[PDB]
Design a protein around this nucleic acid. Structure first.
Ligand SMILES: Nc1ncnc2c1ncn2[C@@H]1O[C@H](COP(=O)(O)OP(=O)(O)O)[C@@H](O)[C@H]1O
Ligand SMILES: Nc1ncnc2c1ncn2[C@@H]1O[C@H](COP(=O)(O)OP(=O)(O)O)[C@@H](O)[C@H]1O
Ligand SMILES: Nc1ncnc2c1ncn2[C@@H]1O[C@H](COP(=O)(O)OP(=O)(O)O)[C@@H](O)[C@H]1O
Ligand SMILES: Nc1ncnc2c1ncn2[C@@H]1O[C@H](COP(=O)(O)OP(=O)(O)O)[C@@H](O)[C@H]1O
Ligand SMILES: Nc1ncnc2c1ncn2[C@@H]1O[C@H](COP(=O)(O)OP(=O)(O)O)[C@@H](O)[C@H]1O
Ligand code: ALF
Ligand code: ALF
Ligand code: ALF
Ligand code: ALF
Ligand code: ALF
Ligand SMILES: [Mg+2]
Ligand SMILES: [Mg+2]
Ligand SMILES: [Mg+2]
Ligand SMILES: [Mg+2]
Ligand SMILES: [Mg+2]
Length: 1609
DNA sequence: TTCCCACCTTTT
DNA sequence: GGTGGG
């Protein structure tokens, strides 16, 4: 074995034998620009340095001779071939091997070794295994010839990814398995970092692994530097290796060799070794001796004789210049084209993009990819070059291309059907030699033929990637031989499951990374502003890959809309920077002469003096370019027309043509229904044949706007389709907005795939003009719908959307069909910069959309009292059709639509077309109205005049003006509708007007005034509704009332009590049929929602209510610990639930009500700080949102007998929103319905009110509202009559064998649920025993009375708060004492660290059995609670001071609050199932509050406010505290009762004291002044003595107590 | 023979 | 920050 140096010392060491072995095969593989070629050339250079002959087979067609020379290759003697086929490449190798005249041969990219059959055949031809088999054959033939000639053969390989592998690593190597085996050495090279010069990236930090070794031990590795333009930093290695081996001294920064100092810092030491090559050889020799594991140990004139013989043989076999010396190959010289940006041409090093090469530009949407592309075309055309544009993205605007200076009439342009076609066209143009630059707009849009013919949702694993990989092989060679530049535009996708590096990627696999000679990363970094206006994009381009000059330089410039790249702007900045232009403050001078003030003017001067500009530019280039550069056309046209004819004959009629004459490329628009929007849009409306996205917050106007464009389109005989994936379209409201319902095609699809397949069908039909998809958010993938709630479908919807765009874009353009996508907003999480908002369904749509609209409600349109509309603002966030970032403000008047004529007035007045004299509006002298209201009405009245004013406004304000047959359309329409219905079932698509299941049907809420506020007379069936509000506001109560009303009409209802606080007995009091109310107390939130879905699907339940989304605890959270972080889990779960539920609920006509709690959002000064639990999904999906609030107390002189209540209709999809209802909730009774009826009746003059006397139709019905209400209860027939009339008068939106099948399906679902979620996961409320409320004495009798139910409830959470030393702990201990007295087990969590065991004993606590913990962190405290709760072994737990519950992070902005909120979710369920009472003591921080957030207020079933009100005195001594407890919240009985008692220090609650007072109050004990008597017998004088008597007679005390309880409980 | 792709807040 | 499947 004999070796050759690799050019890297550390590699030669890693290789064991000191280099690569002669007569063997070697493979080097790695990622793009990793250093494969560079390393290769370095070994050649080293070999040539020793008189060896080398050959380079550049199959990759990317070798730069000048750079090879820079790396020290002798160009003039390096044999070099650029073969056509892979077989040719390998046949050349074999010939050179056999000749015995060549010492080292390298083949650059086996990846590029394209089989002959592949090159002859089309791109998209099944050459399965062909290249592998060829490689396998090559090895067999080569191995022997190489050994006998002692010729080293190096193969460079690229990396591909193996797909659907599940072990090791997914990387592979092109060209089969043969090479792995035959290689004696395999090298894995990788770039691991950048070599920096402060600012500059001057090299690549490199690592090579020896992956296979037949020559020495494998798996050693080498790290070194590749310095651009220099090569492997060899002396750098020598320094590091020398220092490591103690041959070179290193004293801090000082490097010494044998006493003599050689340099300071590695940089200088390296330079010294360059300077002393003799000393370098010496150190190197020693390093090798020390570190090489395997020791190495007339003639040449015969070689040349055989060399020339082989070269002659090769050329005679494979044509003219099939092999030659690199230095003399002219066709190898790198020639460049300007990019249109000067600073980019500088960044590129060589002054532009290289001819005959492939280039890729990628970046985010609207970053400038197309614009830049067109600019290079423009520049190329400016120099007589022919260019082609492949618009696969179907979004090129010819008029805009012209504005950028493209010669439209000579720009070849194609809009291909399939990706294969697109690339076959490229290959044809490449081969023709007639086109100079070709650009392909979006590889992302290069849709494989099979994908187009397949359905949406079909899986085509790696197809596009494999197609791209094939294209590169075929193109690379053809492009080089024709000297044709090919630019690929790519989009960015996000890769998922990546924490290191950056998550961005590029469409269409890995092939392009490798084949590209230049890769550009373009990004918009800011706006170019004109005070008000956004007139351009500030732009930055990074040179990410460069084979032509040093990479990683960058260029910043301006893209001025409608103008292009600001070239002269660059020239000014570059000129000033290079001291060619003088800058004295704001004054710019050139050679003494002043040229302008401010960059703006200096730029204008250079436009004016193009001769001077050329001069400055030339000098800037000379100064700053690192790689400077230095009958016929009639043959070209002959070959051009030949290719164009060939293409058209292959791919149909107008598959390729000149842009200027392509009619189907002209942009045509549709009105949006808003005039100011049409102006903002620049071109006067949305573009036909394009994709458009509208996004915004809930109820912002997305659907409304959508419908308005449909209405306008129908007004002009266009056919429209509406895909209501959100399942919330109201046909009657659509009609009100002027939509022709009877002709509006409408679909309510099951899956997202179905929705998009329908779009594609309608697109292809050519019969529909505008399609709108309502909510991509609601486009639920098929796998998700069939899967469970909580199932993970990573990137499924995104990948589905990405597929849809590919398929749709083309079909939409060819049919001239506009497609509008409505999207919702989600919050992205973990983002401090920019804004946290996003859009559902991935990144594809951002790119494909030609227009993106951000719509927002900015205010209310008021009618003094009434909210009659939404003040609206739309921003044009993306625009491919005109300049972006203009905005439109208008009004959406409910039930009417966009106020178009309102806009017309304002725009008319603004443009001085309409006169405004104060309040008087005049048009052409004639007065048209007073106040904007009337002027608007006048324009409605004079539509002819309106058209006239509109036309003028548009002329004045639009930048970008625009302006037998139908029987064929219907033929194709019916064909598509038939096809759709046969594919997706019975009524998958139909005309809106005839869809019955679309009609809105309502249920009474139990409040009349609410039913009125709701507009349509109640909540809508088959829809989702949300009620939110503060604690004890009436959310559950209201909920139960709707159930009660629904049951009253034979409807089946289910209650999901996730909050674990439903009192069956109270539900009965509210009139709920307990025995038939289905009821579940679910463990996890996923379970809760899976139950909903099951009941929805069953079609057997009519109304389902979920009590507290707040309490819907995700499974992972429940199984996790308290303090565990579950970022966005509940939100994401809710978001998933809505997608799955919406559809099932509509098809079953099931109403679903969600109760939500309020949390406070933090860091908010504007608006209001309130929010709702469980993310953003519900806001959007809810058809109605109710804000309920307690506004006062209903009093009975003394007693608080009810809550005065107000409900606001915060969102309404069913009628006008923002109406409100006030009513009374009478405790134990419910909503006072007849009370409302009286007030509404009197208000509507149906009931007479003469002072206090209420009359109905002459007959007096009662005195005072109280009696009138009672009369209506008594006469239900008359009540119905009055109610019916009130509804007729006040509802703005009025309504419209069998049941045995239902029960069959009901029992089926209940069985299914129980088999899925265990024993009693769902049952009838009336028979659920674990639902019964059971109580514990508080130790105070009067408190047990105040509490209504006689004590605190088991399995519930309770809070006691009050000032310091008020008796919180004492009371707590008293309940424990009482509980222990009855054999219950208790735990005390003393987080406050202040419990006195001896005092607890004095209060009668059994100390020895009281479990007690003093926790370190708050999380620990609550985790202990949860453990005890789950154990089912503890009966009462008390936590002393939530205030003292210190978060773990703190004992190292609302951190305790979030922890408490989490605790409640986890505890509530565990406590109920164990029947464990949990008491929280809280401190106080009216201005009073409670520590630890808002969660506890809600979850507590009882809240106690305890206070010391006085001292119990013994003349001198203070022997106790006089105490008062208020019942502030009560879910178990009526609230707001209070208890006063004594806390006697060292004794506890003065129980017998209470007994005296209660006894006297109830006339059981006589009180004659100071004398207390019981049953005639005197028991004491003064309360003090009477108390002592009852202690003495415990038997009598029991008797009195029993009676007091009977009387007062 | 060779990838594709995000989703979501939470709390004074 | 935890979540894979065609
Ligand atoms: N002509 C050139 N001028 C300057 N730098 C170059 C040139 N060609 C390659 N490089 C640099 O060398 C490194 C590896 O290049 P190369 O060996 O061609 O990678 P590979 O062949 O592995 O794709 C890259 O960082 C690249 O920027
Ligand atoms: N027809 C047009 N009129 C005005 N400005 C446009 C037009 N088309 C594109 N632009 C602007 O040029 C910039 C880049 O557009 P484009 O090159 O199409 O981006 P990409 O193709 O990279 O998605 C954007 O700021 C965009 O608003
Ligand atoms: N059927 C209806 N009757 C009256 N007003 C409605 C109706 N539907 C929607 N609105 C009102 O129009 C505005 C926007 O409605 P919509 O277009 O449905 O919002 P989005 O679709 O953006 O969620 C809201 O303020 C809403 O209350
Ligand atoms: N079992 C009950 N007995 C008496 N009053 C009750 C009962 N449950 C609730 N209330 C009262 O009804 C009002 C609303 O209670 P509820 O509907 O539970 O509120 P939330 O909105 O928190 O669910 C409160 O004043 C509450 O005290
Ligand atoms: N160990 C004790 N000995 C005597 N008096 C006590 C003792 N502990 C508490 N008290 C008295 O009882 C009353 C309330 O105490 P406590 O229940 O601990 O208040 P807090 O509401 O702060 O927990 C106070 O007036 C206090 O002085
Ligand atoms: F193999 Al290369 F740039 F030459 F990725
Ligand atoms: F690639 Al684009 F707007 F054309 F993002
Ligand atoms: F998108 Al919506 F109400 F229809 F927020
Ligand atoms: F939601 Al509640 F009391 F039931 F605040
Ligand atoms: F003394 Al305290 F809560 F104020 F125990
Ligand atoms: Mg290479
Ligand atoms: Mg584009
Ligand atoms: Mg909507
Ligand atoms: Mg409740
Ligand atoms: Mg205390």
């Amino acid at each position: 074995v004999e070796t050759i140096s690799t050019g890297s010392l550390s590699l030669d060491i890693a290789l064991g034998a000191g280099g690569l072995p002669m007569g063997r095969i070697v493979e080097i593989y790695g990622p793009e620009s990793s250093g494969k070629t560079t390393l290769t050339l370095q070994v050649i250079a080293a070999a040539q340095r020793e008189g060896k002959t080398c050959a380079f087979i550049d199959a990759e067609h990317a070798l730069d001779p000048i750079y090879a020379r820079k790396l020290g290759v002798d160009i003039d003697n390096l044999l070099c071939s650029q073969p056509d086929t892979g077989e040719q490449a390998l046949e050349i190798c074999d010939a050179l091997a056999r000749s015995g005249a060549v010492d080292v041969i390298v083949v650059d990219s086996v990846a590029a070794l394209t089989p002959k059959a592949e090159i002859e055949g089309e791109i998209g031809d099944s050459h399965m295994g062909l290249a592998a088999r060829m490689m396998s054959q090559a090895m067999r033939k080569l191995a022997g010839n190489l050994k006998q000639s002692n010729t080293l053969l190096i193969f460079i390989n690229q990396i591909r990814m193996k797909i659907g592998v599940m072990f090791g690593n997914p990387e592979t190597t092109t060209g089969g398995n043969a090479l792995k085996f035959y290689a004696s050495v395999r090298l894995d090279i990788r770039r691991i970092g950048a070599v920096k010069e402060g600012e500059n990236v001057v090299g690549s930090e490199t690592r090579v692994k020896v992956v296979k070794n037949k020559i020495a031990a494998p798996f050693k590795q080498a790290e070194f530097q590749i310095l651009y333009g220099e090569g492997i930093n060899f002396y750098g290695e020598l320094v590091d290796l020398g220092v490591k081996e103690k041959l070179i001294e290193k004293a801090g920064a000082w490097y010494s060799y044998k006493g003599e100092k050689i340099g300071q810092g590695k940089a200088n030491a390296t330079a010294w070794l360059k300077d002393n090559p003799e000393t370098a050889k010496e150190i190197e020799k020693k390093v090798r001796e020390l570190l090489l594991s395997n020791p190495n140990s007339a003639i040449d004139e015969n070689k040349q004789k055989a060399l020339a013989a082989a070269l002659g043989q090769i050329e005679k076999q494979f044509g003219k210049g099939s092999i030659m010396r690199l230095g003399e190959d002219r066709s190898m010289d790198v020639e460049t084209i300007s990019t249109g940006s000067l600073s980019l041409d500088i960044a590129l090093g060589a002054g532009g993009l290289p001819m005959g090469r492939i280039v890729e530009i990628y970046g985010p949407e609207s970053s400038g990819k197309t614009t830049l592309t067109l600019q290079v075309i423009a520049a190329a055309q400016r120099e007589g070059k022919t260019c082609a544009f492949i618009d696969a993205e179907h979004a090129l605007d010819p008029i805009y291309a012209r504005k950028l200076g493209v010669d439209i009439d000579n720009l070849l342009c194609s809009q291909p059907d399939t990706g294969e076609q697109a690339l076959e066209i490229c290959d044809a143009l490449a081969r023709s030699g007639a086109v100079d630059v070709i650009v392909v707009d979006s590889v992302a849009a290069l849709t494989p033929k099979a994908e187009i013919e397949g359905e949406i949702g079909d899986s085509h694993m790696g197809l596009a990637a494999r197609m791209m990989s094939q294209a590169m092989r075929k193109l690379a060679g053809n492009l080089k031989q024709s000297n044709t530049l090919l630019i690929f535009i790519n989009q960015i996708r996000m890769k998922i499951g990546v924490m290191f590096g950056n998550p961005e990627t590029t469409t269409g696999g890995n092939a392009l990374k490798f084949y590209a000679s230049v890769r550009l990363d373009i990004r918009r970094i800011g706006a170019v502003k004109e005070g008000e206006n956004v007139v351009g994009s500030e732009t930055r381009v990074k040179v990410v890959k460069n084979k032509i000059a040093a990479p990683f330089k960058q260029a910043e410039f301006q893209i001025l809309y409608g103008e292009g790249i600001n070239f002269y702007g660059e020239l000014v900045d570059l000129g000033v920077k290079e001291k060619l232009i003088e800058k004295a403050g704001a004054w710019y001078s050139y050679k003494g002469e002043k040229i302008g003030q401010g960059k703006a003017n200096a730029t204008a001067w250079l436009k004016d003096n193009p001769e001077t500009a050329k001069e400055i530019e030339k000098k800037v280039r000379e100064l700053l370019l690192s790689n400077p550069n230095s009958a016929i056309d009639e043959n070209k046209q002959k070959a051009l027309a030949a290719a164009l004819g060939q293409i058209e004959k292959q791919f149909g009629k107008g598959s390729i043509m000149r842009l200027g004459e392509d009619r189907s490329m002209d942009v045509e628009t549709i009105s949006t229904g808003s005039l100011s929007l049409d102006i903002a849009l620049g071109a006067g409306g949305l573009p036909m044949g394009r994709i458009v996205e509208i996004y915004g917050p809930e109820s912002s106007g997305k659907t409304t706007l959508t419908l308005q464009v449909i209405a306008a389109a129908q007004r002009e005989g266009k056919t429209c389709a509406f895909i209501d994936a959100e399942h919330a379209l109201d046909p009657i409201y659509a009609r009100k907005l002027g939509v022709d319902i009877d002709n509006l095609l409408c679909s309510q699809p099951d899956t997202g795939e179905q929705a998009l397949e329908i779009c594609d069908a309608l697109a292809r039909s050519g019969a529909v003009d505008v399609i709108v998809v309502d909510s991509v958010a609601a486009l639920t993938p098929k796998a998700e719908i069939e899967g469970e709630i909580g199932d993970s479908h990573m990137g499924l919807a995104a990948r589905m959307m990405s597929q849809a765009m590919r398929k749709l874009a083309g079909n939409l353009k060819q049919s001239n069909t506009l497609l509008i996508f409505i999207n919702q907003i989600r919050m992205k999480i973990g983002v401090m910069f920019g804004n946290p908002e996003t859009t559902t369904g991935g990144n594809a749509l951002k790119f494909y959309a030609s227009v993106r609209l951000d719509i927002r409600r900015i205010g209310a349109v008021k009618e003094g009292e009434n909210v009659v509309g939404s003040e609206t603002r739309v921003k044009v966030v993306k625009n491919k059709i005109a300049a972006p970032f203009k905005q439109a403000e208008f009004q959406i008047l409910y039930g009417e639509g966009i106020n178009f004529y309102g806009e017309l007035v304002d725009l008319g007045v603004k443009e001085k077309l309409i006169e405004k004299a104060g309040a008087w509006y005049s048009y052409k002298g004639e007065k048209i109205g007073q106040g904007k209201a009337n002027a608007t009405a006048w324009l409605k009245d004079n539509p002819e005049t309106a058209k006239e004013i509109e036309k003028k406004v548009r002329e004045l304000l639009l930048s970008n003006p625009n302006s037998a047959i139908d029987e064929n359309k219907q033929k194709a329409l019916a064909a598509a509708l038939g096809q759709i219905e046969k594919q997706f079932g019975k009524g998958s698509i139909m005309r809106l007007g005839e869809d019955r299941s679309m009609d809105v049907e309502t249920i009474s809420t139990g409040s009349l005034s609410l039913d009125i506020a709701l507009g349509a007379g109640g909540l809508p069936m088959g829809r989702i509704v949300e009620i939110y509000g503060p604690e004890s506001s009436g959310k559950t109560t209201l909920t139960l009332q709707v159930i009660a009303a629904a049951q009253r009409e034979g409807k089946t209802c289910a209650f999901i009590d996730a909050e674990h606080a439903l009192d069956p007995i109270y539900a009965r009091k509210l009139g709920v049929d307990i025995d038939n109310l289905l009821c579940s107390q679910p463990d996890t939130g996923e379970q809760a929602l899976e139950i909903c879905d099951a009941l929805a699907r069953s079609g057997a339940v009519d109304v389902i209510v979920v009590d507290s989304v707040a309490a819907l605890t995700p499974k992972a959270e429940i199984e996790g610990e308290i303090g565990d972080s579950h970022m966005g889990l509940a939100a994401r779960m809710m978001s998933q639930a809505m997608r799955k539920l919406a559809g099932n609920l509509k098809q079953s006509n099931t109403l679903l009500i969600f109760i939500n709690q309020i949390r406070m959002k933090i860091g908010v000064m504007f608006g209001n700080p309130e929010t709702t639990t469980g993310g953003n999904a519900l806001k959007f999906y809810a058809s109605v949102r109710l804000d309920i609030r307690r506004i006062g107390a209903v009093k009975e002189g003394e007693n608080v007998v009810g809550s005065e209540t107000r409900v606001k209709v915060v969102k309404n999809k069913i009628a006008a929103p923002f109406k409100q209802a006030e009513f009374q909730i009478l405790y134990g009774e419910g909503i006072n319905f007849y009370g409302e009826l009286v007030d509404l009746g009197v208000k509507e003059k149906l009931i007479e009110k003469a002072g206090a006397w209420y009359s109905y139709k002459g007959e007096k019905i009662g005195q005072g509202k109280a009696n009138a209400t009672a009369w209506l209860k008594d006469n239900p027939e008359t009540a119905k009559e009055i109610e019916k009339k009130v509804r007729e008068l006040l509802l703005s939106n009025p309504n419209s064998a069998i049941d045995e099948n239902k029960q069959k399906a009901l029992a089926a679902a209940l069985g299914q649920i129980e088999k899925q979620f265990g024993k009693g996961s769902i049952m009838r409320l009336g028979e659920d025993r674990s639902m019964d409320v059971e109580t514990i004495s508080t130790g105070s009798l009067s408190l047990d009375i105040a509490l209504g139910a006689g004590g605190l409830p088991m399995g519930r959470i309770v809070e006691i708060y009050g000032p310091e030393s008020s008796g919180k702990t004492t009371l707590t201990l008293q309940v424990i004492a009482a509980a222990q007295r009855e054999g219950k087990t208790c735990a005390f969590i003393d987080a406050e660290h202040a419990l006195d065991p001896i005092y607890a004993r004095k209060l009668g606590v059994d100390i020895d059995n009281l479990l007690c913990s003093q926790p370190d962190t708050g999380e620990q405290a609550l985790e202990i609670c949860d453990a005890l709760a789950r154990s089912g072994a503890v009966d009462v737990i008390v936590v002393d001071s939530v205030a003292a519950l210190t978060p773990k992070a703190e004992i190292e902005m609302g951190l305790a609050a979030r922890m408490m909120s989490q605790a409640m979710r986890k505890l509530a369920g565990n406590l109920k199932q164990s029947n464990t009472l949990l008491i929280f003591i809280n401190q106080i921080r009216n201005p009073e509050t409670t520590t630890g957030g808002n969660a506890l207020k809600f979850y507590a079933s009882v809240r106690l406010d305890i206070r010391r009100i006085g001292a119990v005195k013994e003349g001198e001594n203070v022997v106790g505290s006089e105490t008062r407890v208020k019942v502030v919240k009560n879910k178990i009985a009526a609230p707001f009762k209070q208890a006063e008692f004594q806390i006697l220090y060292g004794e506890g609650i003065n129980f017998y004291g209470e007994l005296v007072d209660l006894g006297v109050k109830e006339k059981l004990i006589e009180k004659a002044g100071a004398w207390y008597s019981y049953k005639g017998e005197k028991i004491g004088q003064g309360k003090a003595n009477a108390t002592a008597w009852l202690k003495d007679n415990p038997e009598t005390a029991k008797e009195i107590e029993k009676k007091v309880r009977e009387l007062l409980l």
